[PDB]
């Protein structure tokens, strides 16, 4: 099995969109970046930006390791279930940026959202959880 590069890319580009509420006067900026990366090496498989390519590679490996350390050391962590499949969503303050990361269930891949420090974490977590629901094609993806 392999990834359809262009469609994954398109999917990530869609995850970028801001929230824009009218019930209350509230609006986020769009995501800084959205990435799918390997849980193993922290290597980037696909990405979308709304800063630079050099900068994303660094952050990705960093969050991979932070995630890896938390995922086996016997912050916020949100246990989630999607169609009986379990994963966990982690938040990490990356300098002035807010990030969420979660393993795509039973896969060797992580989904990573990078947003500005004004993007509320609780909202970021909801965004990534719902996004993950659209990634059933990647559940169990093994390297």
């Amino acid at each position: 099995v392999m990834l359809h590069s262009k469609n994954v890319k398109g999917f990530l580009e869609n995850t970028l969109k801001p929230y824009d509420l009218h019930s209350v006067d509230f609006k986020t900026s769009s995501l800084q970046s959205s990435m799918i990366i390997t849980a193993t090496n922290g290597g980037i498989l696909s990405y979308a930006t709304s800063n630079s390519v050099n900068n994303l590679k660094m952050m990705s490996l960093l969050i991979k390791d932070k995630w890896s350390e938390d995922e086996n050391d016997t912050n916020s962590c949100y246990p989630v279930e999607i169609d009986s499949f379990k994963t966990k969503i982690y938040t990490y303050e990356m300098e002035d940026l807010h990030t969420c990361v979660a393993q795509i269930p039973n896969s060797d891949l992580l989904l990573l959202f990078i947003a500005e420090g004004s993007f509320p974490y609780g909202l970021l977590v909801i965004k990534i959880e719902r996004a993950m629901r659209e990634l059933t094609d990647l559940f169990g993806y093994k390297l």
Binding site: Y19, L21, V24, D25, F26, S76, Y78, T91, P120, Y121, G122, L123, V125, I126
Partner: protein, 67 residues
Amino acid sequence: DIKGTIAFDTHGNVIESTGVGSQRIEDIGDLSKVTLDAEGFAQVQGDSLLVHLYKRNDITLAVYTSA
């Protein structure tokens, strides 16, 4: 009138904030410790501003008005 809102989740993380809500994010610590009535409602206040709380589906809504 409504002077502000904050919505937050069960970890105490913010989902959104407007008006004075954005200036009073630190309130969440206290607010999240409020025990709601049987229907999910409460009213508390730190100062001159009244905080109306409603919680459903693991999300608490706080709106600020005057008292």
